[PDB]
Design a protein around this motif. Sequence first.
Motif, mmCIF file in Angstrom:
data_model
loop_
_atom_site.group_PDB
_atom_site.id
_atom_site.type_symbol
_atom_site.label_atom_id
_atom_site.label_comp_id
_atom_site.label_asym_id
_atom_site.label_seq_id
_atom_site.Cartn_x
_atom_site.Cartn_y
_atom_site.Cartn_z
ATOM 1 N N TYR A 157 0.834 -1.193 0.000
ATOM 2 C CA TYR A 157 0.000 0.000 0.000
ATOM 3 C C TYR A 157 0.874 1.251 0.000
ATOM 4 O O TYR A 157 1.052 1.899 -1.032
ATOM 5 N N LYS A 158 1.418 1.576 1.168
ATOM 6 C CA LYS A 158 2.224 2.782 1.348
ATOM 7 C C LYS A 158 3.733 2.547 1.266
ATOM 8 O O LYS A 158 4.211 1.422 1.413
ATOM 9 N N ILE A 159 4.471 3.627 1.025
ATOM 10 C CA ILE A 159 5.931 3.600 1.013
ATOM 11 C C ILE A 159 6.442 4.798 1.815
ATOM 12 O O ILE A 159 5.935 5.908 1.653
ATOM 13 N N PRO A 160 7.456 4.587 2.675
ATOM 14 C CA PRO A 160 7.953 5.686 3.513
ATOM 15 C C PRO A 160 8.624 6.788 2.700
ATOM 16 O O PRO A 160 9.267 6.506 1.690
ATOM 17 N N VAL A 161 8.470 8.032 3.143
ATOM 18 C CA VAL A 161 8.976 9.182 2.400
ATOM 19 C C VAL A 161 10.504 9.249 2.398
ATOM 20 O O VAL A 161 11.103 9.763 1.454
ATOM 21 N N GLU A 162 11.128 8.734 3.453
ATOM 22 C CA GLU A 162 12.579 8.811 3.599
ATOM 23 C C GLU A 162 13.294 7.617 2.971
ATOM 24 O O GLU A 162 14.523 7.545 2.984
ATOM 25 N N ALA A 163 12.521 6.684 2.426
ATOM 26 C CA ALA A 163 13.073 5.464 1.847
ATOM 27 C C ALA A 163 13.786 5.698 0.515
ATOM 28 O O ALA A 163 13.624 6.745 -0.116
ATOM 29 N N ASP A 164 14.585 4.710 0.115
ATOM 30 C CA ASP A 164 15.295 4.698 -1.167
ATOM 31 C C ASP A 164 16.299 5.839 -1.343
ATOM 32 O O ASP A 164 16.607 6.233 -2.467
ATOM 33 N N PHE A 165 16.805 6.364 -0.232
ATOM 34 C CA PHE A 165 17.945 7.278 -0.262
ATOM 35 C C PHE A 165 19.258 6.543 -0.006
ATOM 36 O O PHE A 165 19.284 5.529 0.690
ATOM 37 N N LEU A 166 20.344 7.059 -0.571
ATOM 38 C CA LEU A 166 21.681 6.631 -0.173
ATOM 39 C C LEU A 166 22.612 7.832 -0.077
ATOM 40 O O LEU A 166 22.643 8.683 -0.966
ATOM 41 N N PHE A 167 23.373 7.886 1.008
ATOM 42 C CA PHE A 167 24.346 8.949 1.211
ATOM 43 C C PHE A 167 25.745 8.366 1.312
ATOM 44 O O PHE A 167 26.058 7.645 2.259
ATOM 45 N N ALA A 168 26.586 8.675 0.334
ATOM 46 C CA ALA A 168 27.991 8.310 0.414
ATOM 47 C C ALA A 168 28.810 9.505 0.881
ATOM 48 O O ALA A 168 29.250 10.323 0.073
ATOM 49 N N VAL B 223 15.439 6.219 10.625
ATOM 50 C CA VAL B 223 16.290 7.312 10.176
ATOM 51 C C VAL B 223 16.361 8.383 11.266
ATOM 52 O O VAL B 223 15.481 8.445 12.125
ATOM 53 N N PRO B 224 17.415 9.220 11.246
ATOM 54 C CA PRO B 224 17.559 10.272 12.261
ATOM 55 C C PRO B 224 16.377 11.238 12.308
ATOM 56 O O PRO B 224 15.851 11.626 11.264
ATOM 57 N N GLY B 225 15.967 11.612 13.516
ATOM 58 C CA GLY B 225 14.872 12.546 13.699
ATOM 59 C C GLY B 225 13.522 11.871 13.834
ATOM 60 O O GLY B 225 12.546 12.499 14.244
ATOM 61 N N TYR B 226 13.468 10.586 13.503
ATOM 62 C CA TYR B 226 12.198 9.873 13.426
ATOM 63 C C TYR B 226 12.002 8.885 14.569
ATOM 64 O O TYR B 226 12.956 8.489 15.239
ATOM 65 N N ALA B 227 10.750 8.495 14.783
ATOM 66 C CA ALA B 227 10.409 7.523 15.812
ATOM 67 C C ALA B 227 10.622 6.103 15.306
ATOM 68 O O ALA B 227 10.935 5.889 14.135
ATOM 69 N N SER B 228 10.448 5.135 16.199
ATOM 70 C CA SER B 228 10.562 3.728 15.843
ATOM 71 C C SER B 228 9.365 2.974 16.404
ATOM 72 O O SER B 228 8.940 3.225 17.531
ATOM 73 N N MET B 229 8.825 2.047 15.621
ATOM 74 C CA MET B 229 7.573 1.399 15.987
ATOM 75 C C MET B 229 7.796 0.065 16.690
ATOM 76 O O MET B 229 8.671 -0.715 16.318
ATOM 77 N N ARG B 230 6.984 -0.179 17.712
ATOM 78 C CA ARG B 230 7.055 -1.403 18.498
ATOM 79 C C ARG B 230 5.659 -1.938 18.796
ATOM 80 O O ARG B 230 4.860 -1.272 19.453
ATOM 81 N N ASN B 231 5.369 -3.139 18.311
ATOM 82 C CA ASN B 231 4.102 -3.786 18.618
ATOM 83 C C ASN B 231 4.251 -4.632 19.881
ATOM 84 O O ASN B 231 5.034 -5.579 19.910
ATOM 85 N N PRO B 232 3.491 -4.286 20.934
ATOM 86 C CA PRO B 232 3.579 -4.921 22.255
ATOM 87 C C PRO B 232 3.272 -6.416 22.216
ATOM 88 O O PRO B 232 3.619 -7.140 23.150
ATOM 89 N N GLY B 233 2.626 -6.869 21.147
ATOM 90 C CA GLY B 233 2.278 -8.269 21.010
ATOM 91 C C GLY B 233 3.337 -9.115 20.327
ATOM 92 O O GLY B 233 3.689 -10.182 20.820
ATOM 93 N N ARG B 234 3.841 -8.637 19.194
ATOM 94 C CA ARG B 234 4.805 -9.390 18.395
ATOM 95 C C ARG B 234 6.225 -8.833 18.455
ATOM 96 O O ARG B 234 7.158 -9.455 17.948
ATOM 97 N N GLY B 235 6.390 -7.665 19.066
ATOM 98 C CA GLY B 235 7.700 -7.042 19.170
ATOM 99 C C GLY B 235 7.865 -5.911 18.178
ATOM 100 O O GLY B 235 6.954 -5.624 17.402
ATOM 101 N N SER B 236 9.027 -5.265 18.200
ATOM 102 C CA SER B 236 9.286 -4.147 17.301
ATOM 103 C C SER B 236 9.406 -4.605 15.849
ATOM 104 O O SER B 236 9.784 -5.741 15.575
ATOM 105 N N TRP B 237 9.098 -3.700 14.925
ATOM 106 C CA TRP B 237 9.074 -4.011 13.498
ATOM 107 C C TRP B 237 10.448 -4.404 12.976
ATOM 108 O O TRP B 237 10.612 -5.444 12.335
ATOM 109 N N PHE B 238 11.428 -3.551 13.255
ATOM 110 C CA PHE B 238 12.802 -3.740 12.807
ATOM 111 C C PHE B 238 13.393 -5.076 13.248
ATOM 112 O O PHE B 238 13.999 -5.787 12.449
ATOM 113 N N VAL B 239 13.215 -5.410 14.523
ATOM 114 C CA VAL B 239 13.759 -6.648 15.069
ATOM 115 C C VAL B 239 13.054 -7.869 14.478
ATOM 116 O O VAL B 239 13.712 -8.836 14.089
ATOM 117 N N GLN B 240 11.722 -7.824 14.429
ATOM 118 C CA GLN B 240 10.935 -8.862 13.763
ATOM 119 C C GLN B 240 11.483 -9.172 12.377
ATOM 120 O O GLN B 240 11.746 -10.326 12.039
#
Lengths: 4, 4, 139, 140, 93, 93
Positions: E1-12, F16-33
Amino acid sequence: VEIX
Amino acid sequence: VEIX
Amino acid sequence: YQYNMNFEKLGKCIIINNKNFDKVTGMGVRNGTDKDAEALFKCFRSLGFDVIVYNDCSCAKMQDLLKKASEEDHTNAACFACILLSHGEENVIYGKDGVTPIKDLTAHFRGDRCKTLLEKPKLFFIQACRGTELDDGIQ
Amino acid sequence: TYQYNMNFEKLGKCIIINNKNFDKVTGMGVRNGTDKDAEALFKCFRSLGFDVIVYNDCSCAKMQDLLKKASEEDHTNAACFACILLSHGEENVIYGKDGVTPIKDLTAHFRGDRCKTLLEKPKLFFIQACRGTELDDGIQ
Amino acid sequence: YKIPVEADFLFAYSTVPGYASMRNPGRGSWFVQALCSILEEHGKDLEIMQILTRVNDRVARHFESQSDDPHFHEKKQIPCVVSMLTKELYFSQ
Amino acid sequence: YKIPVEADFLFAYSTVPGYASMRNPGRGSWFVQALCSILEEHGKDLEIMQILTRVNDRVARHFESQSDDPHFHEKKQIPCVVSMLTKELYFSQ
């Protein structure tokens, strides 16, 4: 969902 | 050598 | 698992080559940057980019350049590339007339702000300082 | 010559910091779900070949001292090092239970000049924490 | 459905946060020299992270400063790749 | 001879810097999953950047937030890899  |  | 590269064009490549700086900035001439920019131009040209080089840009100019590119139609382009050659401190890069945040330059290409580069790689190559520390190395 | 040399007695240490409960003064809520994170990470990195250790609800002092000691250990017979941080966070900083500490201070214990036995060896840090308050609304 | 706005960047980046970047007035900056050399011989056959990793290696190993100042002697540099990419990137086919 | 002190680091941030990170209390955080799921299925055959790129993709595509609070409604996330590595990294062979 919650926020870290 | 120089610095940016 | 790979980005789709099957387009008419690879993409636009903006090279900003800041060598000479306004005396008010206190920044010295970046000798050697011309040899960089030339070697970069050829490299990215060989890859298939449509490369354009802009020299000694102001912060306003740098902003406008990236802003304008983000508004171009990239429907027939695989990706976008931008190269910054200047003085710098962390999170910021020097125009000829001062500094401007890197975030502001790149944010124009966010998904919500540039639909024709959606799901397409957006590449930023930055040759600039990010502080004053030096690496003494080891061994 | 293009890959890291993986031929050592051991793959390496895997430090998991599992911060769930925080002192009320920090204003940070219980991080429910983090036990599932730490559990899955443990199983995963054990499977890879790491010597996995899990630490829970660590103070900043604990986190600092812990990583410092790991950096001072002899890693000569290890291919690499891995550390995973699961906690609250803000940009450039991570929460202990009694407050915050900079990510750079934690990782600096393993710099080349400060951890010679991990020289020319990969040092991996996996960070599950916030880095600010912004949220991505997406598009499409 | 959705795609994050900050995605698909690369910084060298040419260097890590907090640190300086080296430039030789005769041949150019370290990062660019290395970046180009790797691209000229592997630009169309290697994935971008492979490319930038080899660039990291070269800048780290092949370069070390000489200087007429005690603050810039023997100094080193390591570049910094920041990837928000969601796919492998090849510059061909 | 010498090697930079900041070299051979890699940072896999969940966001990414400046942004939050999501965690589902049932299955765990998105990134770690996502990180685990991919390591279980490709930990032993893929290079580290390939792994983390696929993780970036998974978090980006497979996840989207739900909440009856409107300020945490419809939200997305993209992780962030910072590599100072000088070689390719495989966890085997």
